[PDB]
Each structure stands twice: as C-alpha cells, then as structure tokens.
C-alpha cells in the first residue's frame, strides 16, 4: 500500500499511537547480559537502553571489551550503521577506540551537548585547532582541522592519530544542531538535506567501515536517521518503489538494537521524511 495513502489514512483516523504500540508489541527481544554486568554500570547512560549480545560492538582489548553500541546490518539495502549512546565522561576514549577499530569515515551527531538544561553527552571533540585532545586510556590524539558552521548543521574535519603506530586518518563530524528540545521538526526539509550532505561525503559507502550515529540514548533521533536512509535506498533499488513497507524495515532494524523510534511523533516524522524524500527524486 503506497505509504503516502497509508499516511493520510492514519492521520485522518488519528491512530499514530495505535500503530506505534503494535510495533512495540511485535519487536524482537534478545539477551543483553554483557551490558548488565556490574563492571559495566558506569559505561551505560540509561539503565533501560542496552545493546543485544548478538549485535554489540566489541572493543579490541582483553581488559573489558564493552561499549554501548550496536551493528545494524541491512542485507537488501547493502548498508551498515553503528548506533551508539552519546559518550560519557568515562567512555570518550572507548568511543574513539571504536571509530579507529571499525575504520569509520564519519560520525553523525543528532543532539546538542546541553538540552533542556541538562548534559546529554560529553564534550568529546576539540573546539579549537591549537587545543588538541589526548585519550590516555586508549592511546589516541584528536585534532580539529576545520569547521564549517551552517544554519541547520555544522561539518568538522578531525584528525585521529593512533599514538601506538603514528598512523593518522581524517574523520568527518556531521552535527545536526537544530532538532528541537521537545517534539520533532515541523518540516523534514532540513533533516533530509543533512542526510544528503552525509551521503555526498562518502561516509555511508562500502569502501569505509560503518558510519557511527548517536543522539543521547542512540535509539530515537538515531533510529530516524538510519530508517529514512535505508527506506529511500530500497525505493531506488526495487522495480516497485510502492512495495517499501516502513513498519517492516523498522522491525528488521529492531532485531539489531532495541527501542529504535521512541515516540509516535518520531514514527510520523520518519514517514514524512521518506514520503517527502521520494518527491525531488521521482515526481516533481
């Protein structure tokens, strides 16, 4: 059923809450035993958001391999994403270790460091060229190379150095800075343009490791970003674009990380994103 019609049918009936609860009821439940070990309590931002054991990213160290991060592998679309929480004061070095070990080209940030008067994630990248950051626990150095500030997002070039081998890599930081403190954006235009700027960069392409995507918990805004990208890729690839079922794609992604899309308003915004995506590409 053409999703644009399914959309108007749900909107006219005001059933967004009912659709959303159906998804919550059918979603996968897999064990997260490593996340709940007592040694890992200060590595988790939220007690109710954990990576599944089967899909968690492992750090390459014998001490403790745990990070709150999941590999979302979309087989038909041929895309992979790592979805993670915003880094904590004691996990900023783990975060950059993961970016290094997984060969990621891009980091996508969908939150501000402070929102609603509270800290949503650590200040994990340098704000001035001449004041670099060293992570002594993981032996990494991070330098700000350049910054391009636009009305709805900022792009930064960063240099990550493995201090053990003196190898360096260029990491691109895509920072969406205008998601409102409450609810979802009124139009998906600036979000879709952000997604197009991440695509343009090569960060989502198979020649690199998976993109790292985060917000505060790494399930809500982060869920919306990967769901819209995968749905628009499938509508490009298939003979029948109208066959793409956004509820079935979301349930596939929920096999790999719990809780993706946190509210009925985020579900409606994701539909609007794909629906409005398909025009400007296909019809007018």
Ligand X SMILES: CCOC(=O)Nc1cccc(Cl)c1
Q: For tokens 């674009």, what's the residue? A: 241
Using the minimum distance from each CB to ligand X, give the nearer residue, 54 or 237: 237
Contact yes or no for 84/67 (Cβ under 8 A): yes
Helix axis angle for 246-253 and 221-237, nearest 10°, is 120
Q: How far is the CB of 174 from ligand X (least distance, A)?
A: 13
Task: Label the pairing between strands 167-176 and 153-162.
Answer: antiparallel
Respond yes or no: is residue 226 known to be catalytic.
no
262 labelled binding-site residue: yes
Using the minimum distance from each CB to ligand X, give the nearer residue, 45 or 197: 197
Tokens of 47: 């007690």
What does the binding site for ligand X look like in residue numbers (CB under 6 A)? 192, 195-196, 199, 232, 235-236, 241, 277-278, 280-282
181 labelled binding-site residue: yes
Instruction: Please provide the DSSP assignment of 14-43 as one string.
Output: T-HHHHHHHHHHHS-----HHHHSGGGGGG
In our burial notation (b when 16+ CB lie closer than 10 A, e otherwise), range 179-192 reads beeeebbeebeebb
Using the minimum distance from each CB to ligand X, give the nearer residue, 67 or 273: 273
57 labelled binding-site residue: no
85 labelled binding-site residue: no
Residues 6+ apart with CB under 8 A from 51: 32, 34, 35, 57, 68, 69, 70, 257
Cα 163 vs. chain centroid, distance in angstroms?
A: 27
Task: Label the pairing between strands 106-109 and 114-115.
Answer: unpaired
Using the minimum distance from each CB to ligand X, give the nearer residue, 235 or 250: 235
Q: How far is the CB of 211 from ligand X (least distance, A)?
A: 14
Q: How far is the CB of 232 from ligand X (least distance, A)?
A: 4
215 labelled binding-site residue: yes
217 labelled binding-site residue: yes
Using the minimum distance from each CB to ligand X, give the nearer residue, 181 or 186: 186
Q: How far is the CB of 263 from ligand X (least distance, A)?
A: 23
Cα 238 vs. chain centroid, distance in angstroms?
A: 25
- Give the three-state DSSP class for 275: helix
Q: How far is the CB of 1 from ligand X (least distance, A)?
A: 17
Instruction: Return d(Cα 69, Cα 52) in angstroms, integer.
Output: 9
CA atoms within 13 A on the CB side of 273: 28
Please give the annotated binding residues, written as ranges. Answer: 181, 215-221, 262
Active site residues: 215
Binding residues for substrate: 181, 215-221, 262
């Amino acid at each position: 059923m053409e999703m644009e019609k399914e959309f108007e049918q749900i909107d006219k009936s005001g059933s967004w809450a009912a659709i959303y609860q159906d998804i919550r009821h059918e979603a996968s439940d897999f064990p997260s035993r490593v996340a709940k070990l007592p040694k890992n309590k200060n590595r988790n931002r939220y007690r109710d958001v954990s990576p599944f054991d089967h899909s968690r990213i492992k750090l390459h160290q014998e001490d403790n391999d745990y990070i709150n991060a999941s590999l979302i592998k979309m087989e038909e679309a041929q895309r992979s994403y790592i979805l993670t929480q915003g880094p904590l004061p004691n996990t900023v070095g783990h975060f950059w270790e993961m970016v290094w070990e997984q060969k990621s080209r891009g980091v996508v940030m969908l939150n501000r460091v402070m929102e609603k008067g509270s800290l949503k994630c650590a200040q994990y990248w340098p704000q001035k060229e001449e004041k670099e950051m060293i992570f002594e626990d993981t032996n990494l150095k991070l330098t700000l190379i350049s910054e391009d500030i636009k009305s709805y997002y900022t792009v930064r070039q960063l240099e990550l150095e493995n201090l053990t081998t003196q190898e360096t890599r260029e990491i691109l930081h895509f920072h969406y800075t205008t998601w409102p403190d409450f609810g979802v954006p009124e139009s998906p235009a600036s979000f879709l343009n952000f997604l197009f700027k991440v695509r343009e960069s090569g960060s989502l392409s198979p020649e690199h490791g998976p993109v790292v995507v985060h917000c505060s918990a790494g399930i809500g805004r982060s869920g919306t970003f990967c769901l819209a990208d995968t749905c628009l890729l499938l509508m490009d690839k298939r003979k029948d674009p109208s066959s793409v079922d956004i509820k079935k794609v979301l349930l596939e992604m929920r096999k790999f990380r719990m809780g993706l899309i946190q509210t009925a308003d985020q579900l409606r915004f994701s539909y609007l994103a794909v629906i409005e995506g398909a025009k400007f590409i296909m019809g007018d």
